[PDB]
Design a protein around this nucleic acid. Sequence first.
DNA 1: ATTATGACGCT
DNA 2: AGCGTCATG
Length: 427
Amino acid sequence: TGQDRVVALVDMDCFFVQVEQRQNPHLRNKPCAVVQYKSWKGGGIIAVSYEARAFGVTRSMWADDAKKLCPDLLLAQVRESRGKANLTKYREASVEVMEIMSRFAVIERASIDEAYVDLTSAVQERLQKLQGQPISADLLPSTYIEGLPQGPEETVQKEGMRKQGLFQWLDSLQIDNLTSPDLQLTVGAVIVEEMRAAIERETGFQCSAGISHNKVLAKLACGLNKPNRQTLVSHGSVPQLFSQMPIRKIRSLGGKLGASVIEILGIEYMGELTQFTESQLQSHFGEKNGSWLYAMCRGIEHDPVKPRQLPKTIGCSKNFPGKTALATREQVQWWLLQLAQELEERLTKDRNDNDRVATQLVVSIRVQGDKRLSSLRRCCALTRYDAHKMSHDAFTVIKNCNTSGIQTEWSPPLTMLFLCATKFSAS
DNA sequence: ATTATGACGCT
DNA sequence: AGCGTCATG
Ligand SMILES: [Mg+2]
């Protein structure tokens, strides 16, 4: 029934904003956003405080426009180094959080601001340790139970709803009404409360979490009650939760596959997938996608929390849109060098911290007039952490791309440059 | 003129 | 080895 594991997804609330707010107390509890590159339209917003979100401020919005919706919006700018955004401060902040989480359980770094947590073992330890002990509501001060309260005064307030639902849940657990998987999830949520308290105490950062039996449900659960709260999605809550859940909300269905599911099957909500046989879904969407959809619409997913706290690749890139697109050989080389230099510093830090060395260098560019993130990818050996070598090699593998008869000019002009270090080995 | 940056499946 | 999809600060 896909109730074998206890899995959490912890997500730092508006992470880059919290990083700037911890550093500059004047930004705390105010409508605030983080932007990069001030010159064009005041900067592109990449993170927004909940206070600012209330005014309709969103990410991918220009700061000048965000200021129209929210006149008192405060802005913090991403550091800029060698002509490009420098995300070091947030990478370092993210490391502080991951190292704390890693104390409680096996962690999978999902992105700069989120990680999956496999609590299956930690739960078992706590249960035998706490054998015969009832779980108090006081152990779950920030936990929502999805789907509760239900059934025929304080409910007008959201904290009231939260407690009433928690009490119904706990009372059921205590009387033996709710299952052993439900108990495991509950102890799981207790551990996540502790993890989230430790993160806040030791970093100042708040986060939300979802607790369920797999990564997809835990990630969905996480988004149900934000900010600074955590949500338990039990196996039993799935039918009602999915019954009105737009397909695009489920992890991996937010794009073309999701749209094709909706269009081909003529459905809107996740629960509607249950009517189809596994073979039916495999026929439309392929063997892997079909099997996954068949189990997922019933709340079952088997993808493991991978034990990996460290990124698999180390990369950096810069876009050069419109007029800014690079048109000279000298220009391309100079930006490659800027990219290579950031990369050298990050790689050397990586090698000292994490005892590994990258062995491959991937060069990626986007040619002018191409919509895809990458027009092309070429690879070469990464044999030394030297910015001059890396930029020189990077140029060598892409220099053929140039269409111009003249040596100096570059055609077609470049929309993007990207360097990625990959294929790490123990050092 | 979403920017910068990830993990991953398919081939 | 290189490309497409999906995600998000
Ligand atoms: Mg997030």
